[PDB]
Amino acid sequence: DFLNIPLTIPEMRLPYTIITTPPLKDFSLWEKTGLKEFLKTTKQSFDL
Amino acid sequence: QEFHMKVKHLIDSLIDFLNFPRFQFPGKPGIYTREELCTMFIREVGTV
Amino acid sequence: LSKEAQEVFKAIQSLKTTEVLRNLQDLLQFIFQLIEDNIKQLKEMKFT
Numbered sequence: 001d002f003l004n005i006p007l008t009i010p011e012m013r014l015p016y017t018i019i020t021t022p023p024l025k026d027f028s029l030w031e032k033t034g035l036k037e038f039l040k041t042t043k044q045s046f047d048l
Numbered sequence: 049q050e051f052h053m054k055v056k057h058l059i060d061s062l063i064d065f066l067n068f069p070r071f072q073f074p075g076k077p078g079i080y081t082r083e084e085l086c087t088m089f090i091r092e093v094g095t096v
Numbered sequence: 097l098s099k100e101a102q103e104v105f106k107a108i109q110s111l112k113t114t115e116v117l118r119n120l121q122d123l124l125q126f127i128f129q130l131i132e133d134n135i136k137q138l139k140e141m142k143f144t
Contacts, residue, residue, distance in 0.1 A: 013070040052128040059121040066113055086111045093106050 003030035004042045 006026035013020040030036050071080040080088065106112070 012072070013068075015069050015071050018065065018068050049128075049132070052125065055124055055128070056121055059117055059124070063114060063117050066117075086113075089109055090106055090111050093109065093111075094102055 004028050
C-alpha cells in the first residue's frame with residue numbers, strides 16, 4: 001500500500017548545478033506505472 | 049581588447065553560476081543557498 | 097598563529113569565492129592593460 005501512496009515531490013535544485021528538476025505530483029508508483037492495473041492488486045500475496 | 053571583454057564577462061557569469069545552486073542536508077535543517085551555507089561555515093569554523 | 101589559522105581555515109573552505117573571483121577579474125584586467133601597453137610599445141619601437 002505504501003507504493004500505492006500518491007507521493008508529491010516538490011521542485012528542487014540539485015546542488016553544484018543550475019538544474020531544477022520538475023516536481024512530482026501524486027506519484028503513486030504502484031499505480032502510475034500501471035502495475036496496479038496490470039496485476040489487479042495493490043500488494044503481493046503468494047501461496048505455493 | 050575583445051578577449052579582455054570576453055574574460056571579464058566570463059568571470060562575472062561564473063560568479064552568478066556559483067551562487068545559483070541550493071543545498072540540502074539531513075543533519076542541517078532546511079535548505080541552504082550557497083551564501084547561507086558559506087556564512088554558517090564561517091561562523092562555526094571561527095568559533096570552534 | 098591562532099589569528100592567522102582561523103582566517104586561513106575559513107578561506108580554504110570556499111568561503112571567499114566571490115571576493116577572490118572579483119580580485120582575479122581585476123588582476124586579469126590589469127594584465128590585459130599591461131599586454132596592450134606592451135603591444136603599443138612594440139609597435140612604437142619597430143625593428144625595421
